[PDB]
Amino acid sequence: KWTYFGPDGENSWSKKYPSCGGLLQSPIDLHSDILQYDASLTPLEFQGYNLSANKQFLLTNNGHSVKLNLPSDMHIQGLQSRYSATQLHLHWGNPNDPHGSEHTVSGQHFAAELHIVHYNSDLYPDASTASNKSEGLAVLAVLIEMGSFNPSYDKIFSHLQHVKYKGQEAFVPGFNIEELLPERTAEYYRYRGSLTTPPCNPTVLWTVFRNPVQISQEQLLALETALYCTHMDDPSPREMINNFRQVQKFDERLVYTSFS
Amino acid sequence: KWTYFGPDGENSWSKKYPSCGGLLQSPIDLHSDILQYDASLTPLEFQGYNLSANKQFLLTNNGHSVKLNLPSDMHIQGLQSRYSATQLHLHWGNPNDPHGSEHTVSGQHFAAELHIVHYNSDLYPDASTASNKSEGLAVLAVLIEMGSFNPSYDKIFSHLQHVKYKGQEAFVPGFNIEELLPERTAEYYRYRGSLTTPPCNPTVLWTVFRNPVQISQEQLLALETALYCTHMDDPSPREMINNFRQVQKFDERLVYTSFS
Ligand SMILES: NS(=O)(=O)c1c(F)c(NC2CCCCCCC2)c(S(=O)(=O)CCCO)c(N2CCCCC2)c1F
Ligand SMILES: NS(=O)(=O)c1c(F)c(NC2CCCCCCC2)c(S(=O)(=O)CCCO)c(N2CCCCC2)c1F
Ligand SMILES: [Zn+2]
Ligand SMILES: [Zn+2]
Incomplete structure (x- = not known):
């Protein structure tokens, strides 16, 4: 139905998912030409992010990324509405071009990107209901680069070998999800945009933190090499690589920054 | 039918032109990860580029860009087949974001981009016949950076105020098209790709010169502000800006370089 490579790739999403166009x-x-400092932008607060290690959270290969289900007890404070968490997931490149962040900064890719997806729990009863509705979603984006081994990201990556193929599932003990966030979360880019996957609904308030986190080259290579887009009974297996969208035109619109 | 913005923009081109997907x-x-030095990439020979000054060549605003007809007497020597010229045209951004090149270098746009389009006159009798066939097209790309005034590009730009609206035409007296090429044309990137506009045929052998040319801010501002996508008789004029395609995915493709 949709992919990031070949005839069902991103230039063809709009055929069956019109909002992608x-x-x-x-x-x-x-990049500087579309940024504007906004002193009204206050620091976000993260509530309920300390998940219990005695509780289990579902990790799934859905054929396009690895996703961790998150409880609606997790909230963002500091937006117009309360947003409650629904899930997180990643995007990355491939071992021969390990530059697979979705957002770029001054034209530069980072190695990977984390998305923590939330829904407007003040207006809507659940993420599905909010997804295609006004003010429906708020996503936190974390840029990832190569550096030191990251024990917090390994609380996810250590389970990759159990979700190699589409539809496979594994359980991840709770941990504090703030450990996936960078330093000085108070510095971020803010703009109104979309899901970066089908159905590409234009219903996302984006927060891209300015500062990246670091994972080891070994961690990045495990992420890049562990997973497949296909079911385990698929005679045509496809490696799950390059699962990021290209940057979109952004014309006569502004990105607001919390830093000058 | 196709545009660079809004519903008929580039994410929807595949609905209209199958090759665009x-x-x-x-x-x-x-960028470095995908570059491979190739010592077989020897200098192209530009033959008949010094157009007869007693001939005139048609400059047209076709609603998407400004194009100059070139004669088949112009050809590239140094490829497996001779390629004969058909036209040149430009791509640019807008005054608030004057970074409208199509190819990027390490994630960075240049101000604008010149394309000189050729067809395989050894294999095919004309450009329209060559365009959907094996090895049918060769395009030279010149990156354009903000810098010194360029008297050679002004041989085109001095006519922009006579092709302001869609369908309008002006004659350009023959001049040396080689004056539009950068320093050290022996230094280039080579790859197999496509038209960057509908119909997006995957039949183009691309040569992107390594070194940009310079035009002044004043020349760039004239290119970004002179032209409209609409007919003169349209009382709702639409500026011709940002007429470049976003960069495409490139995996299991390499770019070959004549420089290391
Ligand atoms: N990058 S993103 O932040 O835009 C973003 C999202 F937001 C949502 N899911 C949201 C959950 C809300 C409830 C219904 C679905 C809408 C979006 C999802 S999703 O899991 O729900 C799949 C939805 C349909 O493709 C994804 N994927 C796409 C497939 C790989 C896993 C992450 C995503 F990449
Ligand atoms: N960027 S590019 O170099 O790929 C490239 C081309 F190559 C060709 N022309 C090719 C050769 C001449 C006509 C035969 C069909 C193939 C197109 C053309 S074209 O004039 O022939 C139009 C083709 C239909 O849209 C264009 N345009 C797009 C619109 C504005 C003027 C330049 C182009 F941008
Ligand atoms: Zn995402
Ligand atoms: Zn072109």
Whole structure:
């Protein structure tokens, strides 16, 4: 139905998912010509992010990324509405071009990107209901680069060998999800955009933190090499690589920054 | 029918032109991970580029860009087949984001981009016949950076105020098209790609010169502000800006370089 490579790739999403050719598409290149400092932008607070290690959270290969289900007890404070968490997931490149972030900064890719997806729990009863509705979603984006071994990201990566193929599932003990966030979360880019996957609904308030996190080259290579887009009974297996969208046109619109 | 913005923009081109969602699409980001030095990439020979000053060549605003007809007497020597010229045209951004090249270098746009389009006159009797066939097209790309005034590009730009609206035409007296090429044309990127506009045929052997040319801010501002996508008789004029395609995915494709 949709992929990031070949005839069902991103240039063809709009055939069956019209909003992929519509307004407010993400991701974008964050560059001086479209940035404006906004002193009204306050620091986000993260509530309920300390998940119990005695509780289990579902990790799934859905054929396009690895996703961790998150409880609606997790909230963002500091937006117009309360947003409650629904799931997180990643995007990455491939071992021969390990530059697979969705957002770029001054034209530069990072190695990977984390998305923590939330829904407007003040207006809507669940993420599905919010997904295609006004003010429906808020996503936190974390840029990832190569550096030191990251024990917090390994709380996810250590389970990759159990979700190699589409539909496979594994359980991840709770941990504090703030451990996936960078330093100085108070510095971020803010803009109105979309899901970066089908159905590409233009319903996302994006927060891209300025500062990346670091994972080891070994961790990045495990992520890049562990997973497949296909079912375990598929005679045509496809490696799950390059699962990021290209940057979108961003014309006569602004990205707001919390830093000058 | 196709545009660079809004509903008929580039994410929807594949609904209209099947090749725009197919393989080998251009333009691409030229970055280190995908570059491979190739000592077989010897200098092209530009033959008949010094156009007869007693001839005139048609400059047309076709609603998407400004194009100059070139004669088949112009050809590239040094490829397996001779390629004969058909036209040149430009791509640019807008005054608030004057970074409208199609190819990027290490994630960076240049101000604008010149394309000189050729067809395989050894294999095919004309450009329209060559365009959907094996090895049918060769395009030279010149990156354009903000810098010194360029008297050679002004041989084109001095006519922009006579092709302001869609369908309008002006004659350009023959001049030396080689004056539009950068320093050290022996230094280039080479790859297999496509038209960067509908119909997006995957039939183009691309040569992107390594070194940009310079035009002044004043020349760039004239290119970004002179032209409209609409007919003169349209009282709702639409500026011709940002007429470049976003870079495409490029995996299991390499770019070959004549420089290391
Ligand atoms: N990058 S992103 O932040 O835009 C973003 C999302 F937001 C949502 N899911 C959201 C959950 C809300 C409830 C219904 C679905 C809408 C979006 C999802 S999703 O899991 O729900 C799949 C939805 C349909 O493709 C994804 N994927 C795409 C497939 C790989 C896993 C992450 C995503 F990449
Ligand atoms: N960027 S590019 O170099 O790929 C490239 C081309 F190559 C060709 N022309 C090719 C050769 C001449 C006509 C035969 C069909 C193939 C197109 C053309 S074209 O004039 O022939 C139009 C083709 C239909 O849209 C264009 N345009 C797109 C619109 C504005 C003017 C330049 C182009 F941008
Ligand atoms: Zn995502
Ligand atoms: Zn072109």
